[PDB]
Each structure stands twice: as structure tokens, then as C-alpha cells.
């Protein structure tokens, strides 16, 4: 039986994907990955980055599935890069990864906001300088600062993430995009085909970044179909 790992978006919990999984209703096991957050609010994180958190998730998820049978990966937004990186660690251990399903997540090195060098404290001022903004309005210590870090930290991790061209998966990649999304577009999601040695398919859905909710039975059907077909035996 296949186990599909679900990787949430930046501030996303495993409770957000309960309805996404429900819908599965099939001969597929569903394990929702929870990121070690839980009040870990951290700005300018020396410790946090995409491959470092992917190494942690892998250490936590390795015991969940025996080194024999099926494993498929799904990642929405930031979870797309996390699912790719953990799927690489699974493949570098001979786990027989079925496929990789990426949703609203640009291909590695196809992010435009390379503000990796930009310090967290430094970044907010940069956000403040572009627009007509009272320096005090965002820069002041009243929470705006505390509420911003969970998202600010994610921006830096994504911006700083780079994957070498030869580090590829040995399984087919299936990309899903919302036609009215601008955090990720069909154009920047398309180079994921250079992240595999097998097949690749991109499906465009009507919606924005959160189309997932508006196109739930169609998306899960594709994921379900593709999972079963590769794994079928």
C-alpha cells in the first residue's frame, strides 16, 4: 500500500490538509508532515534554512515507512521545496519513491527575490522603502515586527534555497498551478522538469495561490491516479 507524505505551505498546519486528505478516500495511506515550529518564532535564523529543516523532517519521517514499499511526496508552496529535498534523502537511501507532486512552488533557482544576503532586520526596511510608508508604521516594535517573523523567515529560506543542476529525482514529477497565482506561475513552476530523469506533467487549475480548496476533488484524483499507476503491482 502507498504512503503519501503531505508537506504544508509556510504558516500551514497539518489541520489545514485534513479536508485535502479526506477527499482521498482510497487505497492510499496519508501522513501529514508537521514542521518543528510550535512557538519557535525566529528572525535572522542562523540555524533555519531549506536543506537543514529537510534533514530534520527526514530524521523524523524515516521510521514511519519501512525500506521496502511505496512512498509518494506532495508539497504545496514552501512544502514543495521541502518535499523535493526530503524525497532526495529518501532516494539516497533506496526507499523507492513513487512520484513527486509539486503545487504552487517555483522550480529551484527560479525564485526571483534572491534576498538571501538581506538580514531579517534589514529586509523590513527594504519592504518599507519601496512603498509610501511611515517608517514607524512597520519598523516599530509593536507586534507588526513579532507577527512578521514567521513569514519573514520563510522568505529568506526560499530566497536562499538553490539546488545544483545534476541533483535530480529518479521518479516522475507532477506540477499543479493556479492560473491566477503570482507567488508561483506556470512559467517558474515549469523548470521542475530539470529536477527529474523521468516524466513530468504540469496541470493548470483555475484559481490563485489557494485554488487547492476550489479544485479539491480534481487535484486529489490526479495525485491518487498517478500514485497508484506507478506503484501498481
From Swiss-Prot:
InterPro entries: AB_hydrolase_fold, PKS_thioesterase, TEII, Thioesterase. It comes from Mycobacterium tuberculosis (strain CDC 1551 / Oshkosh). Involved in the synthesis of both phthiocerol dimycocerosates (PDIMs) and phenolic glycolipids (PGLs), which are structurally related lipids non-covalently bound to the outer cell wall layer of M.tuberculosis and are important virulence factors. It is an enzyme of class 3 (hydrolase). GO terms for molecular function: fatty acyl-CoA hydrolase activity. Its EC number is 3.1.2.-. Pfam families: Thioesterase. Keywords: Hydrolase, Lipid biosynthesis, Lipid metabolism, Virulence. It catalyses: a fatty acyl-CoA + H2O = a fatty acid + CoA + H(+). Belongs to the thioesterase family. Gene3D superfamilies: alpha/beta hydrolase. This is Thioesterase TesA. One of its GO terms (biological process) is lipid biosynthetic process. Transmembrane segments: none annotated. The gene is tesA. The active site is at 77, 181, 209.
Amino acid at each position: 500500500a502507498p504512503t503519501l507524505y503531505i508537506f504544508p505551505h509556510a504558516g500551514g498546519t497539518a489541520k489545514d490538509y485534513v479536508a485535502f486528505s479526506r477527499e482521498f478516500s482510497a487505497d492510499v495511506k496519508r501522513i501529514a508532515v508537521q514542521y518543528p515550529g510550535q512557538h519557535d518564532r525566529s528572525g535572522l535564523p542562523p540555524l533555519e534554512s531549506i536543506p537543514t529543516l529537510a534533514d530534520e523532517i527526514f530524521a523524523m519521517m524515516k521510521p514511519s515507512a519501512r525500506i521496502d514499499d511505496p512512498v509518494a511526496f506532495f508539497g504545496h508552496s514552501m512544502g514543495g521545496m521541502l518535499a523535493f529535498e526530503v524525497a532526495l534523502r529518501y532516494q539516497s537511501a533506496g526507499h523507492r519513491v513513487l512520484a513527486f507532486f509539486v503545487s504552487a512552488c517555483s522550480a529551484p533557482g527560479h525564485i526571483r527575490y534572491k534576498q538571501l544576503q538581506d538580514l531579517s532586520d534589514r529586509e523590513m526596511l527594504d519592504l518599507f522603502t519601496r512603498m509610501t510608508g511611515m517608517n514607524p508604521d512597520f519598523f516599530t516594535d509593536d507586534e507588526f515586527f513579532v507577527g512578521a517573523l514567521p513569514t519573514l523567515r520563510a522568505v529568506r529560506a526560499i530566497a536562499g534555497y538553490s539546488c545544483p543542476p545534476e541533483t535530480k529525482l529518479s521518479c516522475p514529477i507532477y506540477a499543479f498551478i493556479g492560473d491566477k497565482d503570482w507567488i508561483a506561475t506556470q512559467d517558474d513552476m515549469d523548470p521542475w522538469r530539470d529536477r527529474t530523469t523521468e516524466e513530468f506533467s504540469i496541470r493548470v487549475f483555475p484559481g490563485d495561490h489557494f485554488y487547492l480548496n476550489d479544485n479539491l476533488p480534481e487535484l486529489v484524483s490526479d495525485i491518487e491516479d498517478k500514485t497508484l499507476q506507478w506503484h501498481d503491482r
